[PDB]
Amino acid sequence: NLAPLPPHVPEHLVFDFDMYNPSNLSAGVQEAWAVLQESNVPDLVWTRCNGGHWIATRGQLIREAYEDYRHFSSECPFIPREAGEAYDFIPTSMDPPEQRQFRALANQVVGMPVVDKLENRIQELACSLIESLRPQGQCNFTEDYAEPFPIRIFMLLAGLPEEDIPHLKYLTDQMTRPDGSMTFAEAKEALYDYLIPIIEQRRQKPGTDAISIVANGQVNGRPITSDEAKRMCGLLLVGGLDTVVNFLSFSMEFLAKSPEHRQELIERPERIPAACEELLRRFSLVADGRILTSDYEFHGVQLKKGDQILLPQMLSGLDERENACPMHVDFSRQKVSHTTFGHGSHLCLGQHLARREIIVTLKEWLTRIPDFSIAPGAQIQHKSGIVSGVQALPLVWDPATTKAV
Ligand code: HEM
Ligand SMILES: CC(C)(C(=O)c1cccnc1)c1cccnc1
Secondary structure (H helix, E strand, O other): OOOOOOOOOOHHHEOOOOOOOOOOHHHOHHHHHHHHHOOOOOOEEEEOHHHOEEEEOOHHHHHHHHHOOOOEEOOOOOOOHHHHHHOOOOOOOOOOOOHHHHHHHHHHHHOHHHHHHHHHHHHHHHHHHHHHHHHHOEEEHHHHHHOHHHHHHHHHHHOOOHHHHHHHHHHHHHHHOOOOOOOHHHHHHHHHHHHHHHHHHHHHOOOOOHHHHHHOOEEOOEEOOHHHHHHHHHHHHHHHHHOHHHHHHHHHHHHHHOHHHHHHHHHOHHHHHHHHHHHHHHOOOEOEEEEEOOOEEEOOEEEOOOOEEEEOHHHHHHOOOOOOOOOOOOOOOOOOOOOOOOOHHHOOOOHHHHHHHHHHHHHHHHHHOOOOEEOOOOOOOEEOOOEOEEOOOEEEOOHHHOOOO
């Protein structure tokens, strides 16, 4: 299902990429997207899939478009257009200077000082989850750790019932890796039905949870509205439920396959932080975009006002012009260059939270379960979308090689 090419698009710029179902999926999701950086592919292409849109393929263009909010607006950041259209999260569907005030609040809730406060719980939950898995010699990493770990910390931050996990996660999943079961707007509405009552309750009777702070915050000297709060919280939810969750499984899947990488971390733990950035570069997973606010000529291509452009965060660090041997994991690269957490005004506020969760997991898993591998005859499947994922990650190990702490 290719849409007829608009008049302004030179046929030589066509490259029919399906962000939802790339061709090489079997080879891995990052590998499937990297096809866009092959020699035969222009720097800026048009795809007729998902209704027709541009895709910038190089770290340089992505960062440029990201910096340029005058031309490239966050107003309609999702493809297909109907999704970008229905998209109304804050601060994400706003451009500076408006974005700034909401960002400042969102920072209050997820920023550094919060992580610093949550640290012991993060470490507590990791250790507990791992210890519980250890003696089994086998899990479903995706369902066994990658989901509970980051989710439960979020649920704690947000003050929401663990019981709501399944329902929330389903809906979150519909936004980033649509099934066909529901449209973005339906998914969005349903999360909204969830939130409303909660916000109301927390405007009346404030807690110390993230939702309470958001619901009662100040923006531009006045009180946030209910609708604004509902709209920030919607973003926070997706961030908590759908980001770190997917990242951990790619990393884990790599670790399962590379004994030498595991060992390196065990003997030279001072390398963990460096390793985490490298894994963030290699297993980068997000791809959203922007809308053209006007006609504009960008690197010699004419973009028409209203044109959508996918600026895959994923691709910057995979770009050879940016990283030598991009597909190779090397914990000792002189310069790890990525835009995994975005670029420009929308740089991810939850990055601090995500790094703390990644580092704790590596340190804590390796400690207890130094030696593991993918289950025999398990075929690992990746999934593409706004946020890519791993479908299931069967791991096996000998309990006898584990260490209890
Ligand atoms: C692997 C982990 C994550 C990755 C790769 C990631 C990636 C991103 C990206 C690329 C953006 C910018 C989107 C744009 O420019 O349209 C973003 C924004 C944002 N992320 Fe993260 N995210 C992650 C985890 C988190 C977590 C755990 C939270 C907190 C619950 C969070 C909260 C935010 C917020 C609030 C924004 C909006 C900032 C603004 O619009 O000013 N993210 N994230
Ligand atoms: C692409 C993006 C920004 C994403 O991956 C994300 C979501 C919340 C926090 N951090 C990143 C996203 C995903 C789903 C809904 N809105 C935004």
